[PDB]
Every structure is written in structure tokens, then in C-alpha cells.
UniProtKB/Swiss-Prot annotation:
Residues 9-113 form the Bromo domain. Expressed at varying levels in several tissues, whereas a smaller transcript was expressed specifically in testis. This is Bromodomain adjacent to zinc finger domain protein 2B. The gene is BAZ2B. The chain holds residues 2054 to 2166 of 2168 of the full protein. It is found in: Nucleus. Signal peptide: none annotated. Component of the BRF-1 ISWI chromatin remodeling complex, at least composed of SMARCA1 and BAZ2B, which regulates the spacing of histone octamers on the DNA template to facilitate access to DNA. Within the BRF-1 ISWI chromatin remodeling complex interacts with SMARCA1; the interaction is direct. Component of the BRF-5 ISWI chromatin remodeling complex, at least composed of SMARCA5/SNF2H and BAZ2B, which regulates the spacing of histone octamers on the DNA template to facilitate access to DNA. The lineage of its organism: Eukaryota, Metazoa, Chordata, Craniata, Vertebrata. Belongs to the WAL family. Regulatory subunit of the ATP-dependent BRF-1 and BRF-5 ISWI chromatin remodeling complexes, which form ordered nucleosome arrays on chromatin and facilitate access to DNA during DNA-templated processes such as DNA replication, transcription, and repair. Both complexes regulate the spacing of nucleosomes along the chromatin and have the ability to slide mononucleosomes to the center of a DNA template. The BRF-1 ISWI chromatin remodeling complex has a lower ATP hydrolysis rate than the BRF-5 ISWI chromatin remodeling complex.
């Protein structure tokens, strides 16, 4: 509260660490469904069903241009990619499995790096 400060985590390396994790995700062999925005004019149903589209190249642009206030907002966008994927794809489709694999990969890196 006012003039009563909680001890705060050192956040000075967060930008660099999130960039490193994003690089690891960008180069994973199962990243291919997520590298670019879904083409809303070629993919039936996507525009209407998925209210907040997100993809790795959009996350990279936002990280490079100071649009994440903190590391939690970055993780929210990464998780949005995989949440969208589950909404639109069967668990045992190629894209569906790819999403489950990539979420598992991300969450371990996140835990190992920050938690
Ligand atoms: C990411 C995703 O759900 C998706 C769906 C259909 C595509 O043709 C490409 C990507």
C-alpha cells in the first residue's frame, strides 16, 4: 500500500530471456502452424470463431517494439496461440498435436527460466 513497498523481483533481464525463449520456440520443428498469422481470407471459419488471433511473428514484433509492459503479458500472448489452436483443431490432427507439443515445450522453458 501507500509508502509500504514489497520486495521486488529483479526484472532487468526479462526482455533478453523472453527473446531467447521465443527464439527456441521459433526454431522448433513443430512451430510451422504458428510462425505467421492464419490467413483469414483462405481459412474457412477462423475469422468468426477465433476472436483474438495470435502467432509467433506478431509476438516477436511486439517484443521488439516495447509493446509488452512485463513478462506476464508476454506469456499471456504465447498461451493465446495454443488456446486458439485447441479451440480450432482436433487433438489428434497434425496441427492439434503440434500445439500440445509446443505448449509443453514453452511451459518447461518458462518454469526453468523464471520459477
Ligand atoms: C494455427 C491454426 O490453427 C491453423 C489452422 C489452419 C491452417 O491452415 C493453419 C493454421
Amino acid at each position: 500500500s501507500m509508502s509500504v513497498k514489497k520486495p521486488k523481483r529483479d526484472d532487468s533481464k526479462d526482455l533478453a530471456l523472453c527473446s531467447m525463449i521465443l527464439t527456441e520456440m521459433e526454431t522448433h520443428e513443430d512451430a510451422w502452424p504458428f510462425l505467421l498469422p492464419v490467413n483469414l481470407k483462405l481459412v474457412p471459419g477462423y475469422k468468426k470463431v477465433i476472436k483474438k488471433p495470435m502467432d509467433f511473428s506478431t509476438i516477436r514484433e511486439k517484443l521488439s517494439s516495447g509493446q509488452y509492459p512485463n513478462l506476464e503479458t508476454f506469456a499471456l500472448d504465447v498461451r493465446l496461440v495454443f488456446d486458439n489452436c485447441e479451440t480450432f483443431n482436433e487433438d489428434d490432427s497434425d496441427i492439434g498435436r503440434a500445439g500440445h507439443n509446443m505448449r509443453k515445450y514453452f511451459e518447461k522453458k518458462w518454469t526453468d527460466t523464471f520459477k
